[PDB]
């Protein structure tokens, strides 16, 4: 009865919280991809420095 409505409100809040956590994880993955691209660029720069040896 009223317990159904209570648990449904709880489940709606939980769906919202889980979607928020998913979006946070995805933002973290985007930023980590940025850092991975920065590391690729650094690998290229250090290779261009190594070539300048012999």
């Amino acid at each position: 009865k009223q317990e159904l409505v209570t648990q449904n409100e709880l489940l709606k809040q939980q769906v919202k919280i889980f979607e928020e956590d998913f979006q946070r994880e995805r933002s973290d993955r985007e930023r980590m991809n940025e850092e991975k691209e920065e590391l690729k660029k650094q690998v290229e720069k250090l290779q261009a420095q190594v070539t300048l040896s012999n």
Binding site: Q7, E9, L10, L11, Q13, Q14, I17, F18, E20, D21, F22, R24, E25, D28, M32
Partner: protein, 299 residues
């Protein structure tokens, strides 16, 4: 007063709190009782969220009230822990979480008991007792987990003051191995160390398991006033000093010892022996420098 907190799984929990309390402190109490850190909690009253900078009295929360707790899937900070096998695990940690906590979390997520774990971060080994903030471990940092098999043991070695160090040892490690480890981690020559456990001195020829030394055992360390080899040094003023040295010492070592004795910086130190100069590179053995042979300094 006392309030109730219910989860989607009907886990009712009682909280002794006052109406003048904030909500972040209610979250801290839930953390004290259930171990759920406040960043993974979401409290709801009559369908409304509970903000950390707000009080219970502001939400008209009376006695015997029932709040609803929804737990999140993640927190604000996570770390990666990579096994030697190559598996990466994510951990929901906090800046205040000690190494004991992250070892327990690794146990929860992988069954690896904490007594078989040692964590490495940027070439340093993490020790139980200190937090991630102490080791400057930021979010998304990677800890390399390694296992101390063959009887891995953390022992503590405490001097008569309080300077306690931690050593990784096996039961088969002899007292000489332990003194060598102390020499490598603190610089103390083993000819000046005396190790004591349960009240008796430890002989160089016995193992740790000979003295029934187990995990987390505290050995006491006493420093002798002397070593086996000493050399004499004469200052430009003519005062004589004595340095506790070893034949395997380098001229940089004896110059550091001179700096300890007379405060003279090593760059203004020119050592002479038998009408020869002493290169910083070579050791005392390479100069045939025997015990009690005197050296002269002058620039």
């Amino acid at each position: 007063m006392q309030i109730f907190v219910k989860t989607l799984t009907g886990k009712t929990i009682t909280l002794e709190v006052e109406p003048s309390d904030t909500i972040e402190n209610v979250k801290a109490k839930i953390q004290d009782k259930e171990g759920i850190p406040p960043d993974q909690q979401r409290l709801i009253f009559a369908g409304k969220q509970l903000e950390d900078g707000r009080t219970l009295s502001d939400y008209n929360i009376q006695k015997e009230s029932t709040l609803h707790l929804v737990l999140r899937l993640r927190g604000g900070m996570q770390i990666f822990v990579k096994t030697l096998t190559g598996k990466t695990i994510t951990l929901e940690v906090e800046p205040s979480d000690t190494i004991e906590n992250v070892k327990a979390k690794i146990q929860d997520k992988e069954g690896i008991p904490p007594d078989q774990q040692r964590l490495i971060f940027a070439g340093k080994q993490l020790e139980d007792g200190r937090t991630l903030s102490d080791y400057n471990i930021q979010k998304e940092s990677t800890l390399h987990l390694v296992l101390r098999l063959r009887g891995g043991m953390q022992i503590f070695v405490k001097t008569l003051t309080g300077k306690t160090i931690t050593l990784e040892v096996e039961p088969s490690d002899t007292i000489e191995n332990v003194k060598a480890k102390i020499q490598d981690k603190e610089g103390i020559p083993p000819d000046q160390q005396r190790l004591i456990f349960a009240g008796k001195q430890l002989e160089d020829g016995r193992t740790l398991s000979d003295y029934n030394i187990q995990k987390e055992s505290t050995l006491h360390l006493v420093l002798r006033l002397r070593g086996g080899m000493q050399i004499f040094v004469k200052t430009l003023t003519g005062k004589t000093i004595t340095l506790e040295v070893e034949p395997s010492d380098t001229i940089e070592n004896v110059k550091a010892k001179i700096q300890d004795k007379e405060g003279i910086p090593p760059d203004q130190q020119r050592l002479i022996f038998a009408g020869k100069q002493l290169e910083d590179g070579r050791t005392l053995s390479d100069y045939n420098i025997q015990k009690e042979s005197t050296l002269h300094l002058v620039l």
